[PDB]
Design an enzyme around this catalytic site. Structure first.
Site, short mmCIF file in Angstrom:
data_model
loop_
_atom_site.label_atom_id
_atom_site.label_comp_id
_atom_site.label_asym_id
_atom_site.label_seq_id
_atom_site.Cartn_x
_atom_site.Cartn_y
_atom_site.Cartn_z
N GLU A 196 15.95 32.78 40.82
CA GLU A 196 15.73 31.48 40.44
C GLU A 196 16.02 30.73 41.46
O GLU A 196 17.53 30.56 41.62
CB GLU A 196 16.04 31.35 39.27
CG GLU A 196 15.19 30.53 38.49
CD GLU A 196 15.60 30.43 36.74
OE1 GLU A 196 14.51 30.33 35.98
OE2 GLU A 196 16.77 30.52 36.44
N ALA A 202 21.89 34.89 29.48
CA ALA A 202 22.03 36.03 29.08
C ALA A 202 22.83 37.13 30.04
O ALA A 202 23.34 38.18 29.57
CB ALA A 202 20.61 36.54 28.73
N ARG A 242 28.32 32.22 26.95
CA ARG A 242 28.17 32.46 28.52
C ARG A 242 27.96 31.37 29.38
O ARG A 242 28.41 31.24 30.53
CB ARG A 242 27.29 33.70 28.92
CG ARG A 242 27.70 35.01 28.38
CD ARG A 242 26.76 36.51 28.43
NE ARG A 242 27.53 37.39 27.97
CZ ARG A 242 26.91 38.76 27.51
NH1 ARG A 242 25.38 38.70 27.96
NH2 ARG A 242 27.58 39.57 27.05
N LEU A 255 31.50 30.30 29.91
CA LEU A 255 32.13 30.94 30.73
C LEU A 255 31.51 30.68 32.43
O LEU A 255 32.49 30.45 33.17
CB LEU A 255 31.84 32.65 30.60
CG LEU A 255 32.33 33.18 29.23
CD1 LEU A 255 31.98 34.64 29.09
CD2 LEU A 255 33.77 33.07 29.56
N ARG A 256 30.39 30.43 32.53
CA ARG A 256 29.66 30.23 33.94
C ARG A 256 30.05 28.88 34.45
O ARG A 256 30.38 28.56 35.49
CB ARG A 256 28.15 30.37 33.96
CG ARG A 256 27.77 30.11 35.32
CD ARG A 256 26.20 30.52 35.30
NE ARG A 256 25.49 29.86 34.16
CZ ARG A 256 24.24 30.27 33.74
NH1 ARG A 256 23.70 31.41 34.25
NH2 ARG A 256 23.80 29.62 32.73
N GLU A 305 24.96 22.10 32.04
CA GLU A 305 24.54 22.99 30.84
C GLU A 305 25.43 22.94 29.53
O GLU A 305 25.29 23.36 28.73
CB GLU A 305 24.28 24.26 31.14
CG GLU A 305 23.25 24.50 32.10
CD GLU A 305 23.29 26.13 32.63
OE1 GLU A 305 24.22 26.67 32.58
OE2 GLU A 305 22.30 26.38 33.20
N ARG A 358 13.22 35.67 36.08
CA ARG A 358 12.02 34.93 35.47
C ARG A 358 10.63 34.93 36.19
O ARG A 358 10.59 35.28 37.55
CB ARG A 358 12.43 33.68 35.13
CG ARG A 358 13.52 33.77 34.09
CD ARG A 358 13.66 32.20 33.21
NE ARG A 358 14.73 32.41 32.27
CZ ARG A 358 15.56 31.71 32.01
NH1 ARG A 358 16.01 30.53 33.26
NH2 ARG A 358 16.69 31.86 31.28
N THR A 365 23.46 38.15 37.00
CA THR A 365 24.43 39.26 36.97
C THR A 365 23.92 40.69 37.12
O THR A 365 23.98 41.52 38.05
CB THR A 365 25.47 39.24 35.92
OG1 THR A 365 26.01 37.88 36.06
CG2 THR A 365 26.52 40.49 35.93
#
Ligand SMILES: Nc1ncnc2c1ncn2[C@@H]1O[C@H](COP(=O)(O)OP(=O)(O)O)[C@@H](O)[C@H]1O
Ligand SMILES: Nc1ncnc2c1ncn2[C@@H]1O[C@H](COP(=O)(O)OP(=O)(O)O)[C@@H](O)[C@H]1O
Ligand SMILES: Nc1ccn([C@H]2C[C@H](O)[C@@H](CO)O2)c(=O)n1
Ligand SMILES: Nc1ccn([C@H]2C[C@H](O)[C@@H](CO)O2)c(=O)n1
Lengths: 240, 224
Positions: B34, B13, B156, B159-160, B165, B96, B17
């Site tokens: 995290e 999300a 995203r 993108l990362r 993932e 988190r 950042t």
């Protein structure tokens, strides 16, 4: 605390529960923390304060049996839960029992050190836990220990042969333990000997190298040696 | 006396950042990331338990979830211990919380049968205890919910470019999104009853990066 902490150590079915739970009646300052094996064969977590008024606390699974049936799958889960539930029980009795005893002694049935350095370590050595599981386990155990009070004042090692232990597993009749072979008990036996008899086993816990250890042979029938064992125990405790 | 604020929201999300930007507004403001690196490289070069979980969730979900939360509790306690506490108005932003670990992620895995009943029960018992002991120390003063659509999150993730993932499907992200909405928007989702009282600032982060979002935080905090 002023409470002396003494761990009772020994292989499966050596007779630790039997001995210590009889032993502890000799003094009202003497209490025992049992190993939470019931919590392992019947896995339960806490009920909500309203739900428990109308819903029963049901029987859960048996993680002890899951470990014995498939150790390569369930060892890590079992060993983490074992240690957690032990620490919970030991910490509560420390903070709750023997208040206003003169010379209070709390006997622990096994310790967080045997969970790691005997049982978990042996599972790793047998490839029942992989590198990742063994790293996670030790990382967690180190952390739990540095957080938590439980430091032992002494260890009473109840020494019995693998054969004695195998017979006593049969006598006790725990269902999940009935397929345990002699070779498994033998491996646990050698770990105990290295730790408590030869004292060659190195742990992350420096003080342990120094902790007084009383070794008692428990191979004989209960009546035959109990008097000498008791006298050896009181003598040992007098030294701490 | 350190105010504790958790930043919540779905995978990619924009929480790391956003919190890294926030951090710079004050010397009084710190962040607890995290411990993802710790999960990617298991050590006291180790295994990738994040990868093992994504590749074989029925085998590794309990192990991953337990370590995730353990490592978070550790990092969060560590930060309270030293990092500020000589500050005028100290604030700690958590990336988190133990509550998302349990009630969003582990819970979703149990729901999808990636944990069985025994694993879920052990997990809950472990979490209950681990929290009764600490928790009081890690109790939240507020929550900032970064809201982005599952599709934004999937983009995203790409993108990362975290390898582990890249195979996550939209549907998994939808499930996570519903749990977050239920927890933080609808408030229909725990046995930590103080949480029902904790203020939540919801920020929409669906747009490309934001000025106004950061100011909204600065002021939301003055209300805590
Ligand atoms: N010295 C002894 N002589 C005969 N039976 C014993 C003796 N010590 C223990 N037992 C029996 O052996 C079994 C295992 O003992 P237990 O105390 O449950 O072992 P542990 O607590 O070490 O696992 C039980 O059935 C118990 O009656
Ligand atoms: N508002 C935004 N607009 C465009 N890209 C963003 C935005 N927020 C985050 N990103 C990018 O999306 C990816 C995920 O962000 P990150 O902060 O790592 O997510 P999180 O910490 O929530 O998992 C990163 O590559 C980051 O550069
Ligand atoms: N860390 C521990 C502790 C106990 N046990 C087992 C041995 C016995 O079968 C039972 C109770 O001691 O649990 C185990 O495998 N690992
Ligand atoms: N309790 C948690 C916390 C995080 N993650 C995952 C989602 C991301 O892929 C990665 C880092 O946020 O870890 C998870 O599965 N469970």
């Amino acid at each position: 605390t002023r409470i002396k902490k003494i761990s009772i150590e020994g292989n499966i079915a050596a007779g630790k529960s039997t001995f210590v739970n009889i032993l502890k009646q000799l003094s009202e300052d003497w209490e025992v923390v049992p190993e939470p094996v019931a919590r392992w064969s019947n896995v339960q977590s806490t009920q909500d304060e309203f739900e428990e008024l109308t819903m029963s606390q049901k029987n859960g699974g048996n993680v002890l049996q899951m470990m014995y049936e498939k150790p390569e799958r369930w060892s890590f889960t079992f060993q983490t839960y074992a240690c957690l539930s032990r620490i919970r029980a030991q910490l509560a009795s420390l903070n709750g029992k023997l208040k206003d005893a003169e010379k209070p002694v709390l006997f622990f049935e096994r310790s967080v050190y045997s969970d790691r350095y005997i049982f978990a370590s042996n599972l790793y050595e047998s490839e029942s836990m992989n590198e990742t599981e063994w790293t996670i386990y030790q990382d967690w155990h180190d952390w739990m220990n540095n957080q938590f009070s439980l430091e032992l004042d002494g260890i009473i090692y109840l020494q019995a042969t693998p054969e004695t232990c195998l017979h006593r597993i049969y006598l006790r009749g725990r269902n999940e333990e009935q397929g345990i072979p002699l070779e498994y008990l033998e491996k646990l036996h050698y770990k105990h000997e290295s730790w408590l008899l030869h004292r060659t086993l190195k742990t992350n816990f420096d003080y342990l190298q120094e902790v007084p250890i009383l070794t008692l042979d428990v191979n004989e029938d209960f009546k035959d040696k109990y008097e000498s064992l008791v006298e050896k125990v009181k003598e040992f405790l007098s030294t701490l």
